[PDB]
Design a protein around this nucleic acid. Structure first.
Ligand SMILES: Nc1ccn([C@H]2C[C@H](O)[C@@H](COP(=O)(O)OP(=O)(O)OP(=O)(O)O)O2)c(=O)n1
Ligand SMILES: [Ca+2]
Ligand SMILES: [Ca+2]
Ligand SMILES: [Ca+2]
Ligand SMILES: [Ca+2]
Ligand SMILES: [Ca+2]
Length: 901
DNA sequence: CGAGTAAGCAGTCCGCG
DNA sequence: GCGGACTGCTTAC
């Protein structure tokens, strides 16, 4: 096999590399890598090295990396550009792996671990590590084993061994329900004392040294805790055995309001799963506890126990250990679903970076572009200092708030990357500038043509047309990967819909799910067999289809995020290729494109309808248009349609055969107007939306910018078995909105769009009547909580104190003195409830950590004093009044003359 | 900690004769 | 009471 790196580090004048050799074995090596850097040189000096602008460079070969670094410093002191890859390990990878890397994930040791630490005096601070580590479960991907290290004797209690037999039994048998599929994969090791547990752990770790190290909050808790506890017991040298090169660094993570410490283990790639999830999931959750995320992703129930965690080991060590093992398995289950580890490896090996660098799009793109340029003997510029400056972004159309019955939406495929490629925007392709006219003048095609030579953006920038820039070249490569995966995602989605249809008629038989590739549209043969399958088999297929879709979603959306990140990286001062001219070339062209095509679409439809001055485009944001199709439907007449799917087809056909060619001609003209390199503005139909045929549903509504809802029948070519709501921006979509309120507001919207005013009034009346029975957590608002100290004045609210922060201060007073009550963590999320006038808490709200039950110390009082009236008005009635007045609808029945009867 | 900007709503403070 | 100036948070793209 071809060799691939596992990890790479610079330590002084050495590169330390762990790698898989040509025989599939793991090796480590120290290499005295001699880096090269570059300086500009005279034209008369023969070279093969050129900077990205075609200026000649001399290569400087250094005796060692320290010399290269010292040279960089002296080049600053002189005031001359020191060119080349200053991150020498990236240059090492580029030299050592001068090919497209094919990696074999079965050779990569992926470790998932979780530790337990009993603490009577509150949260066990990792930087102190003053309490014994009493459980470690460490799953190894190569062995496919859960290694359990269980402490039986502690200052906080002596316990009996954990029992695999009880662990396996049902909760209803008094067991822990550790999933049977992992029971045989558990290797249980009890220890008499913590010293021997830790010593054995380190020996195990040497034998099976993680390459990828993950788990839940491992970087902020488990790793620094284990490191510091071993440091405190045995000394630093022993603790540094967690690094295969025996090198570690305390790393200080700073943000706006404070800083925290992590432990960098040289020669390991830590990908904390909580951070993978935050970057890659495209969710915003009310809580990031593993219990909360597991329930959301996997539909598994919360891990249940009596009393606080601080007493669980002594009261129920059996459950304590089982829940430790289950917690490690839950992260593996999430990854089997989301496949974020697979994604990180793909992207990291593609870019040729330390895998953990996938968290930084700047670092990822710096390496991709470096490797691209190096291939052609080109030399990258030195990174420079830039002051942070604001710059303009997208255009968003102000919609007229209203109901909108029939809507067809369109938007650009990979808008910003397509702009980059079309215009040929790149550091080295800048050809110059032209005199800019007001944007409105380009939008209406009255401005002078910018250039007859170069490819232009309406911000004044001109680019070469003879050759593709490195940015368009590299962005195109990832875009193409994105498109392949999106194809698989969309096929799986359509396949899912076929299964749902077939579920309306399940067969009474015993059979199997069909062995199929859900990434490809089902053939007629498969479709036939599906119509003969049982509900059990169908549901299993649907589950598999949806997992396939999830896998496709992860691969496509995060590749989309990568290329979109390049567009934004051009507007970050830390990026090697920061340039506001290019960042704004993209965004300004985007604004033109939208408004240009709005004008074209209006012109086209006014034409087909024999009208003048009518607005058919009702809204748009960045790269999208929403087109009113009422007039198109009305031209055939609702009476001519057999059912909803009939007019959906008709609109689908109209969009495909009339709208899209019209849209395409409009953009081709714009491309010529701007003299662009290649026409790449492809604005495909997204959604077809309307009420069910013959209903009183209103179909859709807008309340304002970034606030709308649509009843959609077909999304990007997926024809749904049941209509699906596309809701954007509204309260149903905000993690801040109480869970039960999100649900009620969604059902209010479904009724509005699908059934009409009377159905909405019927539901509202019931919700208003019954909501006081809703569980307190389900009706609590949610907020991130920053600057709790800033607004704390003797435990009371200082001036301008935010409502949620006030709730926390109330909580803090109510639990004061308790070393045991859960603390609110600065920067994390809280539930918030309003309190009735004259409550014992002495303020108008209380807040506590989200994803948790409020401590029993105060729970009864909170429940008794919860202000349901304020809660209802603020979270439910106010947003609903906003939806209904926008939609010209009443959520309560108004009096009429009929009431005389 | 980790690419970008646009823009919505909640809440505080306070004006508005 | 409502809105503007401002802070805080959250979402659409
Ligand atoms: N998370 C996001 C979403 C969008 N955008 C910017 C870049 C996108 O290109 C543009 C349009 O947003 P879309 O959500 O429509 O994304 P794309 O057009 O890139 O992809 P798709 O092909 O799925 O429409 O807005 C961004 O910077 N970051
Ligand atoms: Ca735990
Ligand atoms: Ca788009
Ligand atoms: Ca599309
Ligand atoms: Ca059937
Ligand atoms: Ca869009």
């Amino acid at each position: 096999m071809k060799e691939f790196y596992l990890t790479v580090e610079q330590i002084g004048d050495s590169i330390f590399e762990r790698y898989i050799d040509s025989n599939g074995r793991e090796r480590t090596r120290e290499v005295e890598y001699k880096p090269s850097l570059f300086a500009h040189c005279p034209e008369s000096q023969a070279t093969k090295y050129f900077d990205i602008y075609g200026k000649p460079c001399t290569r400087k070969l250094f005796a060692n990396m320290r010399d290269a670094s010292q040279w960089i410093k002296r080049m600053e002191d002189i005031g001359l550009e020191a060119l080349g890859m200053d991150d020498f390990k990236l240059a090492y990878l580029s030299d050592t792996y001068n090919y497209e890397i094919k990696y074999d994930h079965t050779k990569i040791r992926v470790a998932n671990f979780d530790i337990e630490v009993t603490s009577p005096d509150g949260f066990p601070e990792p930087s102190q590590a003053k309490h014994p580590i009493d459980a470690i479960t460490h799953y190894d991907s190569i062995d496919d084993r859960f290694y359990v290290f269980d402490l039986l004797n502690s200052p906080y209690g002596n316990v009996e061994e954990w029992s695999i037999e009880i662990a396996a039994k049902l909760q209803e048998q008094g067991g822990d329900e550790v999933p049977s599929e992992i029971i045989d994969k558990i290797i249980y090791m009890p220890f008499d004392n913590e010293k021997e547990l830790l010593m054995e752990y380190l020996n195990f770790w040497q034998q099976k040294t993680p390459v990828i190290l993950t788990g839940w909050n491992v970087e902020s808790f488990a790793i620094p805790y284990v490191y510091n506890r071993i440091k405190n017991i045995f000394g630093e040298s022993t603790a540094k055995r967690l690094s295969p090169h025996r090198k570690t660094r305390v790393k200080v993570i700073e943000n706006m309001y404070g800083s925290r410490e992590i432990i960098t283990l040289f020669g390991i790639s830590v990908l904390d799963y909580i951070d993978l999830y935050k970057k890659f999931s495209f969710t915003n959750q009310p809580s990031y506890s593993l219990d909360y995320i597991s329930e959301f992703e996997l539909n598994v129930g919360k891990l249940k126990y009596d009393g606080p965690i601080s007493k669980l080991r002594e009261s129920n060590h059996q459950r304590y250990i089982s829940y430790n093992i289950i917690a490690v398995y839950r992260v593996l289950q999430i990854d089997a679903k989301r496949q974020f580890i697979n994604l990180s490896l793909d992207m990291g090996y593609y870019a040729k970076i330390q895998i953990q660098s996938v968290f930084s799009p700047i670092k990822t793109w710096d390496a991709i572009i470096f490797n691209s340029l190096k291939e052609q003997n080109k030399v990258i510029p030195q990174g420079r200092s830039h002051p942070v400056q604001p710059y303009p972004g997208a255009f968003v159309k102000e919609p007229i708030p209203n109901r909108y019955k029939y809507v067809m939406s369109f938007d650009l495929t990979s808008l910003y990357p397509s702009i980059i490629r079309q215009v040929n925007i790149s550091p080295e392709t800048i050809a110059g500038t032209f005199k800019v006219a007001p944007l409105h003048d380009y939008i209406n095609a009255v401005a002078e043509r910018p250039s007859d030579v170069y490819s232009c953006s309406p911000n004044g920038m001109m680019y070469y047309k003879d050759r593709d820039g490195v940015v368009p070249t590299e962005i195109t490569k990832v875009f193409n990967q994105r498109k392949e995966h999106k194809g698989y995602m969309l096929a799986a989605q359509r396949n899912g819909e076929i299964i749902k249809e077939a579920l309306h008629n399940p067969n009474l038989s015993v059979d199997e799910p069909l062995d199929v590739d859900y990434r490809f549209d089902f053939s007629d043969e498969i479709k036939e067999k599906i119509k003969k399958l049982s509900a059990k088999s169908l549901n299993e297929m649907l589950f598999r289809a949806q997992r396939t879709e999830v896998a496709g979603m992860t691969a496509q959306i995060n590749r989309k995020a990568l290329i979109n990140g390049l567009a934004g990286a051009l507007g970050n001062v830390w990026f090697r290729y920061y340039d506001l001219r290019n960042a704004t070339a993209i965004t300004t062209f985007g604004q033109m494109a939208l408004q240009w095509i709005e004008r074209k679409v209006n012109e086209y439809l006014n034409e087909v309808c024999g009208t003048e001055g009518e607005a058919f485009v009702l809204y748009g944001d960045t790269d999208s248009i929403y087109v009113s199709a009422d007039k198109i439907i009305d031209k055939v007449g609702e009476s001519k349609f057999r059912d909803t799917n009939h007019w959906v087809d008709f609109l689908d056909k109209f969009a495909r055969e009339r709208m899209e060619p019209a849209i395409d001609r409009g953009f081709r003209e714009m491309c010529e107007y701007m003299n662009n390199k290649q026409h790449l503005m492809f604005m495909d139909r997204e959604a077809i939306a309307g009420p069910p045929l013959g209903s009183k549903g209103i179909g859709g509504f807008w309340t304002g910018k970034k606030r709308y809802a649509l009843n959609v029948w077909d999304m990007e070519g997926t024809r749904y078995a049941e209509p699906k709501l596309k809701i954007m921006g509204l309260e149903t979509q905000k993690s801040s909105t109480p869970k039960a309120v999100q649900k009620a507001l969604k059902e209010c919207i479904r009724r509005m769009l699908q059934e009409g005013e009377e159905s909405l009034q019927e539901y509202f009346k019931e919700f208003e009547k019954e909501f006081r029975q809703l569980n307190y957590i389900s009706i609590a608002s949610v907020s991130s909580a920053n600057n709790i100290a800033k607004y704390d004045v003797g435990g009371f609210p200082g001036p301008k104190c935010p409502f949620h922060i006030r709730g926390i201060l109330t909580y803090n007073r109510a639990i004061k003195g308790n070393i045991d009550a859960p603390q609110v963590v600065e920067g994390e999320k809280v539930y918030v409830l309003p309190l009735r006038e004259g409550n014992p808490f002495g303020d108008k709200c209380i807040a506590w950590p989200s994803g948790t039950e409020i401590t029993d110390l105060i729970k009864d009082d909170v429940l008794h004093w919860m202000d349901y009236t304020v809660l209802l008005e603020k979270t439910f009635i106010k947003p609903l009044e906003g939806f209904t007045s926008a939609a010209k609808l009443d959520y309560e029945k108004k009096a009429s003359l009929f009431d005389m009867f």
